[PDB]
Structure 1
Amino acid sequence: HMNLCYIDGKFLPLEEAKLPVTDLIIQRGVGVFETISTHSRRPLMLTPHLKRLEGSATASSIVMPATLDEMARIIREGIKKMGCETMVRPYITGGDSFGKDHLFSSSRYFVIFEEIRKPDPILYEKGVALHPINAERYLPSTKSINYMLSFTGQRDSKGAYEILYCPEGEIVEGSHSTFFLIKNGHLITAPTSRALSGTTRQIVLELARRGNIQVEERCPLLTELPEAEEAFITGTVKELLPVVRIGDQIIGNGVPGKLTKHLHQVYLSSIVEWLE
């Protein structure tokens, strides 16, 4: 499929788009981004993602190089050009210098558009296995471009779907996901002091509120997994994806659970509410 990069006023073929090696995104990993998905070629949680992008940029001392309205206009135009369900990634770079004011004031920006790659249907029927590691994301409210740990953590993950950040036995989040445990019919998920404030997470808490499902905002523990009924990971692209194994531990009876399948169905039935 055709893939785009919006950069410097133009929607380029993604393979043509290039960034100056002066940019501190390249030299020193100074960059923040979001991942935005579409349903019916409309962006899911567009405003919440763009507010989170500005939040990341501000927390990283980056001055936004475009307004949120302009980032929204570009995203909409690139989706129109794609003419398919799209995964969209707006990037904000450090640019060429850190000023005497302790800000990155010449930030660059670009927006990647790719045909969306949903997890295979079989993964929703089977559920996935997570690989726990003794590590976590620093400043986890900020979605920087530093995802090195998500790949080096796979060195000994032996083909697990995703890495799970379990610093000192406390489950925080996936490398690309919010993590939820189900224990005695209630949700357990790490607080926003430890894990990224997921857009999908924020919708799942709202669905829990609507369904009178109790939510405990505390880290699930690896040692609680034998008492767990179910588990799932959330994000843009993957939606709610059942977790049936973590390390050598089977979750409940090792197939996707009733409350997971329920929350996924309600999510998909309700999803247009959060489209823009």
Structure 2
Amino acid sequence: GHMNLCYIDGKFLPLEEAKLPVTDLIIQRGVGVFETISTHSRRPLMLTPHLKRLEGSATASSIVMPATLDEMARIIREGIKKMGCETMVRPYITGGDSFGKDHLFSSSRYFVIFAEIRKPDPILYEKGVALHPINAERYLPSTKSINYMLSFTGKGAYEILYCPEGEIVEGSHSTFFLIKNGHLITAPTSRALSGTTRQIVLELARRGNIQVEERCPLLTELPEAEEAFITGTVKELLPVVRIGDQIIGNGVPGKLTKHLHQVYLSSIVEWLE
């Protein structure tokens, strides 16, 4: 393993030493966007797609990029080289100190945290997890912002599930997939964040001739479901056995979830950079 690191103001620091000025509007106004990038075999997964989504997030938030993607990639690769071990990398783009008369954040800061990967406990893959449905949605759902406050305030659920007017969109942190009569159902990216894990799962489904519906699954359809799972770079495919007071299928991780997870882990090297 290795010491957790933070790249900030041109230097790799011990994470515990990295500080941001209190003037930054990430602190005062929640103006921040970020990515989570994970390694397999010490290579970043979906590095260019994560970086393209980071720019996407900044641009949609009126934040000018403080560094080019080529620079971010060079910093991310140097940091993973310093860690010497499987790493979770989180680049952060801040608003910086001002919103100009031009309606842009033009003094954005950025920093990159490097940490050891802490996957969810293998028991949660064996037993599956519970989600808490709420009648709320993520606004600007293409933006991966730093605003997770609602995820904390919102029955021992692993994650809240945004279910506006009873349409399942996604988790606070994770893409949601439903399996009904061997089909994969997941919200369209008009409503859900364009997950990189979500994208890989959709391409594995295409390859394995599994039909995909890009529509919001309904809370009212959950009794008719066999399986469910949530996705994100660190968790991969995490089975979901319970949503509110509805058990999913027979209440244990299902056949198609475990299959797609195994295909994911066998296939993952194609998307490493």
How would you bin the TM-score normalised by the shorter chain? over 0.9
Between the aligned partners of 1:109 and 1:248, the Cα distance in structure 2 is 42
Deviation at 1:147, TM superposition (A): 0.9
2:173 match: secondary structure = coil
TM-score (norm 1): 0.97
Shift of 1:270: 0.3
Q: What is the Cα deviation at residue 123 of structure 1?
A: 0.9
How much has 1:37 moved relative to structure 2? 0.8
Q: What is the DSSP-based 3-state SS (H/G/I as helix, E as strand, rest coil) of the residue aligned with 1:188?
A: strand
CA–CA separation in structure 2 for the residues paired with 1:82 and 1:13: 11
- Secondary structure at the aligned position of 1:200 is classed as helix
Q: Over the residues paired in the alignment, what is the CA RMSD in angstroms? A: 0.8
Measured after TM superposition, the shift of residue 160 of structure 1 is 1.3
Partner of 1:217: 214
Whole-angstrom distance in 1 between the partners of 2:49 and 2:152: 27
Deviation at 1:134, TM superposition (A): 1.2
What is the CA-CA distance between 1:15 and the residue it aligns to?
0.7
- Mean CA deviation greater in 126-135 or 43-52: 126-135
Q: Distance between the aligned counterparts of 1:224 and 1:264, measured in 2?
A: 24
Shift of 1:118: 0.2
CA distance in 2, matches of 1:30, 1:174: 21
Identity of aligned residues (%): 100
Map Cα deviations across residues 203-228 of structure 1 (whole Å, 9 max, x no partner). 00100100111111110011100000
Counterpart of 2:189 in structure 1 is 192
Deviation of 1:27 (Å): 1.0
State the Cα distance separating 1:136 from its structure 2 match. 1.5
Aligned-partner SS, 1:11: strand
**Distance (whole Å) between structure 2 residues aligned to residue 185 and residue 164 of structure 1:** 22
1:38-65 alpha-carbon deviations (Å, 9 max, x no partner): 1111111000000000000000011001
* Displacement of 1:159: 1.7
After TM superposition, give the deviation of residue 249 of structure 1 in Å. Answer: 0.7
Q: What's the offset of the Cα at 1:171?
A: 0.5
The one of 186, 198, 201 aligned to 1:201: 198
Task: Say which SS state the counterpart of residue 240 (structure 2) adopts.
Answer: strand
- Residue 253 (structure 1) aligns with: 250
Deviations 1:50-84 (A, max 9, x none): 00000000000110010101101111111111111
Name the CA distance, whole Å, in 1 between partners of 2:30 and 2:243.
Answer: 31
Does 1:12 pair with 2:9? no
Comparing 1-10 and 216-225, the one that deviates more: 1-10
CA deviations over 1:8-32 (Å, ceiling 9, x no partner) = 0011111100001111111111111
CA distance in 2, matches of 1:266, 1:72: 27
Measure, in 2, the Cα distance between the counterparts of 1:78 and 1:150: 29
Task: Give the Å deviation of 1:172.
Answer: 0.6
Q: How far apart are 1:167 and its partner, in Å?
A: 1.1
Report SS of the residue matched to 2:90: strand
Structure 2 unmatched runs, 5+: none
Deviation, structure 1 residue 100: 1.5
**Offset of 1:251 from its aligned partner?**
0.5
Paired with 1:253 and 1:90, the residues of 2 have a C-alpha distance of 40
CA distance in 1, matches of 2:160, 2:233: 17
Q: 1:44 and 1:152 mapped to 2: Cα distance?
A: 31
Report SS of the residue matched to 2:92. Answer: strand
- 1:126-141 aligned at under 5 Å gives the runs 126-141=127-142
Per the TM alignment, residue 161 of structure 1 is displaced from its structure 2 partner at its CA by 1.2
Secondary structure, aligned partner of 2:6: strand
Of residues 77-86 and 227-236 in structure 1, the stretch that sits farther from structure 2 once superposed is 77-86
**Could you tell me how far apart the structure 1 residues matched to 2:5 and 2:126 are?**
32
Runs of 4+ in 1 over 2 A off after TM superposition: none
Aligned length: 272
**Which 5+ residue runs of structure 1 have no aligned equivalent?**
none
Deviation at 1:252, TM superposition (A): 0.6
Aligned counterparts, 1:1-80, within 5 A: 2-80=3-81
Separation in 1, partners of 2:32, 2:132: 27
The CA distance in 2 between the partners of 1:85 and 1:148, in whole Å, is 28
For the residues of structure 2 that align with 1:22 and 1:34, how far apart are their CA atoms? 23
Deviation at 1:168? 1.3
